[PDB]
């Protein structure tokens, strides 16, 4: 890879991978394809990044929320619940860990497992509250692809945050533990349960 | 002297505050219109803008 050294030194593992491939902390943004229909154009993965922290403004326009990296979007939704508002550094660290933990289990790409876990927990359709007067029934509507991702994310995070309460197990562990099961739904995870149970009710009015 | 520039300009302002007041309670019968203060060495000039100056 034609190593280059100058006055203030840049280390080997640093020099090498960086210029070669644009990949993650160290994980490949290549491969990692969205295994489901729709859900593409709503999951980012190329353009690749280094760390999940970014100063970009996705809030000034409607759908540009989606153009954000789906790994980052996972991190953002981590930092919340009061005390953890802010603290991207807290989350971004946990994320990199979670990837290391997912990577340990069944190999593949932690970043791809993220994709699988998200695409698998998205509700296909759901029920709103339509008044109809007085006692209100539930109309089955099919959820938008954009909301489908968003929902998956908050679902996973919530489910891990709740499992990570009052137990020795850490966030990066519970997050991984969720993402691992959410990759191919085992119905052992908070999200897969709730997603499908929204679709069970969506099918119970139709 | 020995003041801050800050406390000066504020306290200067208050000076014009009390000044204009004193004249307004005095020369109203003369049609007092307000005042101005000119800061110079050797002198401090105050000019009465009252409409009827024959009574001032």
């Amino acid at each position: 890879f034609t190593p280059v050294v100058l006055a203030t030194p840049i280390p080997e593992e640093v020099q090498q991978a960086q210029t070669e491939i644009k990949l993650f902390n160290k994980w490949s943004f290549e491969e990692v394809e969205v295994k489901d229909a729709s859900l593409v154009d709503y999951v980012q993965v190329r353009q690749p990044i280094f760390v999940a922290h970014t100063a970009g403004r996705y809030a000034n326009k409607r759908f540009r929320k989606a153009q954000c990296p789906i790994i980052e979007r996972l991190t953002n939704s981590l930092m919340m619940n009061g005390r953890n508002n802010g603290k991207k550094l807290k989350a971004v660290r946990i994320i990199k860990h979670t990837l290391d933990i997912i990577n340990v289990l069944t190999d593949q790409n932690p970043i791809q497992v993220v994709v699988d876990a998200i695409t698998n927990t998205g509700p296909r359709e759901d029920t709103t509250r339509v008044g109809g007067g007085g006692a209100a029934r539930r109309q089955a509507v099919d959820v938008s692809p954009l909301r489908r991702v968003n929902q998956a994310i908050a679902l996973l995070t919530i489910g891990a945050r709740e499992a990570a309460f009052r137990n020795i197990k850490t966030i990066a562990e519970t997050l991984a533990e969720e993402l691992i099961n959410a990759a191919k739904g085992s119905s052992t995870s908070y999200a897969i349960k709730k997603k499908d149970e929204l679709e069970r009710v969506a099918k119970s009015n139709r | 002297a020995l003041i801050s520039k800050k406390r000066k300009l504020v306290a200067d302002g208050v000076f014009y505050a009390e000044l204009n007041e004193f004249f307004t309670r005095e020369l109203a019968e003369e049609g007092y219109s307000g005042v101005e203060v000119r800061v110079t060495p050797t002198k401090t000039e105050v000019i009465i803008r009252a409409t009827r100056t024959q009574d001032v």
Partner: protein, 141 residues
């Protein structure tokens, strides 16, 4: 007297000023090398200019930086900007236009607010709440 340029970058309230002269390619910030920084969770953030443009290109130039104001994260985005801008400020007065515009092509294709200074800024809080938008609690009766 050797060929040299000076730039800056500003994120939030932070300002990073950087001198680019011709050198054997030391890259330093304040007193320490670019290899330290720390926050360090973001360490790769400020490396990014050295990456997009290739780890060479710095061998004929020394880069020194210093960061005042802002905050822990805010400065980091400002230094990298002063870095990438300074590298493209050096091809402005010295090297070539065609290489220069192949540099802003290498940056802005990807970027993250790189040659472009981020325009966001704290909004003044007004009375009626603890925050800018946020109001106080009212109980009615």
């Amino acid at each position: 007297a050797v060929p040299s340029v000076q730039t800056f970058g500003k994120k939030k309230s932070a300002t990073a000023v950087a001198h680019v002269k011709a050198g054997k390619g030391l890259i330093k910030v304040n007193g320490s090398p670019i290899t330290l920084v720390e926050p360090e969770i973001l360490r790769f953030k400020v490396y990014e200019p050295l990456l997009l443009v290739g780890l060479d290109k710095f061998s004929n130039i020394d880069i020194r930086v210093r960061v005042t104001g802002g905050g822990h994260v805010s400065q980091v985005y400002a230094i990298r900007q002063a870095i990438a801008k300074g590298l493209v400020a050096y091809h402005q007065k010295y090297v070539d236009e065609q290489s220069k515009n192949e540099l802003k092509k290498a940056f802005t294709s990807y970027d993250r607010t790189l040659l472009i200074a981020d325009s966001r800024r704290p909004e003044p809080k007004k009375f009626g709440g603890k925050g800018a938008r946020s109001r106080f609690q009212k109980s009615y009766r």
